[PDB]
Ligand binder design. Structure first.
Ligand SMILES: O=C(O)c1csc(-c2cccs2)n1
Ligand SMILES: O=C(O)c1csc(-c2cccs2)n1
Ligand SMILES: O=C(O)c1csc(-c2cccs2)n1
Length: 284
C-alpha cells in the first residue's frame, strides 16, 4: 500500500502495536559474540543492546578492538551510517578514535546528557573554548571552536587532533536538544528541519566517512533518524515514489543493528516524518 493512506488505515483501526510486533517477529537474528566477551562488559551500556559481529565497527588497536557501534550500509540509497550508544566514562576515548579512523565529518546526538533524572551518556565534548579535552588512552585532543544555540538544536564546530601525527580535522556536532523525556514529538517539523541541517552540512555525503549517530542505546531515536533520511532519499531517486515501503526499509536496516525503532509510537512518528517531509521536498 501507499504510505499516507496505510497510515490513516492503521490509525482508524488502532493496530500500531500489531504492526510493530510483526516487525519484531520478522527481524534478523545474527550473532554478537564479541560484545558478550567478559572483557567487554564495561564497554556496553545495556546488556540487551549489542552490535552484530558481521557489521560491528572495529577499532584499529591490537589489544581490544571492541566498541558498541554498527555500520548500516544502504545499497540502493547509497548512504551509510554508524549507529552507536552514548559514550560511557570508560569509552569516550574509543568513541573519538572511531570518529578519526572512520573519517567521519559529523556526529549526530539525539539525547540530553541527563534525562528523567539519570545520566544517559558521558559529557564527551568540551563546553568552553579554553578548556580542551585530552584522551590519553587513544592520544587525541578535542577543542571547542564555536557553538550556535537555536531553539530546537545546537550546532558545534570541534577540532580533533591526532597527537601521534599532529594531523587535525574539523568535526561538526549536531545536537537535537528537545526530544521529550517520555514519548515522541507531537509534530515532526523540528526533527525534519534538523535532518535538513545535517544534510546541508555535507556530513551525510559520499566524500566523507559515515556520519556517527547516537542516543542513549543507539537504536530508538537513532533508528528514527536514519530510517526517515533513507526513505526520503529513495522517494527522490525512484520513478515511482509511492513504491517506497517504510516497513521493508526498516527490516533491511535491522539486518545491520538489532532493535531499531523501540516502540510503536516511534514507528508511527517515523511514518509521520516521511509523509510530511515528502511534501516539503517538492518539488514543494
Ligand atoms: O564522563 C567522563 O568521564 C568524561 C567525560 S569527558 C572525559 C575525558 C576527557 C578527556 C580525558 S577523559 N571523561
Ligand atoms: O520505484 C521505482 O522506480 C523502483 C521500485 S524498486 C526500484 C529499485 C530497487 C533497486 C534498485 S532500483 N525502483
Ligand atoms: O505516492 C505518493 O504519494 C508519493 C510519495 S513521494 C511522491 C512524489 C511525487 C512527485 C515527486 S516525488 N509521491
Amino acid at each position: 500500500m501507499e504510505m499516507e493512506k496505510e497510515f490513516e488505515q492503521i490509525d482508524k483501526s488502532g493496530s500500531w502495536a500489531a504492526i510493530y510486533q510483526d516487525i519484531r517477529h520478522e527481524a534478523s537474528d545474527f550473532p554478537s559474540r564479541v560484545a558478550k566477551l567478559p572483557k567487554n562488559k564495561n564497554r556496553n551500556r545495556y546488556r540487551d543492546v549489542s552490535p552484530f559481529d558481521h557489521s560491528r565497527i572495529k577499532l584499529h588497536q591490537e589489544d581490544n578492538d571492541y566498541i558498541n557501534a554498527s555500520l548500516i550500509k544502504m545499497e540502493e540509497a547509497q548512504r551509510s551510517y554508524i549507529l552507536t550508544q552514548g559514550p560511557l566514562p570508560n569509552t569516550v576515548g574509543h568513541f573519538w578514535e572511531m570518529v578519526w579512523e572512520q573519517k567521519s565529518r559529523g556526529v549526530v546526538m539525539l539525547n540530553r546528557v541527563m534525562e528523567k533524572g539519570s545520566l544517559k551518556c558521558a559529557q564527551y565534548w568540551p563546553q568552553k573554548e579554553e578548556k580542551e579535552m585530552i584522551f590519553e588512552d587513544t592520544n587525541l585532543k578535542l577543542t571547542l571552536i564555536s557553538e550556535d544555540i537555536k531553539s530546537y538544536y545546537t550546532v558545534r564546530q570541534l577540532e580533533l587532533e591526532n597527537l601521534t601525527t599532529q594531523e587535525t580535522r574539523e568535526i561538526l556536532h549536531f545536537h537535537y536538544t528537545t526530544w521529550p523525556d517520555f514519548g515522541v514529538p507531537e509534530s515532526p517539523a523540528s526533527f525534519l528541519n534538523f535532518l535538513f541541517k545535517v544534510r546541508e552540512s555535507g556530513s551525510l555525503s559520499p566524500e566523507h566517512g559515515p556520519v556517527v549517530v547516537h542516543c542513549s542505546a543507539g537504536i530508538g531515536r537513532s533508528g528514527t533518524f536514519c530510517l526517515a533520511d533513507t526513505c526520503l532519499l529513495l522517494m527522490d531517486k525512484r520513478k515511482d515514489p509511492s513504491s517506497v515501503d517504510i516497513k521493508k526499509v526498516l527490516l533491511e536496516m535491522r539486518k545491520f543493528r538489532m532493535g531499531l525503532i523501540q516502540t510503536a509510537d516511534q514507528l508511527r512518528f517515523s511514518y509521520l516524518a516521511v509523509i510530511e517531509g515528502a511534501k516539503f521536498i517538492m518539488g514543494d
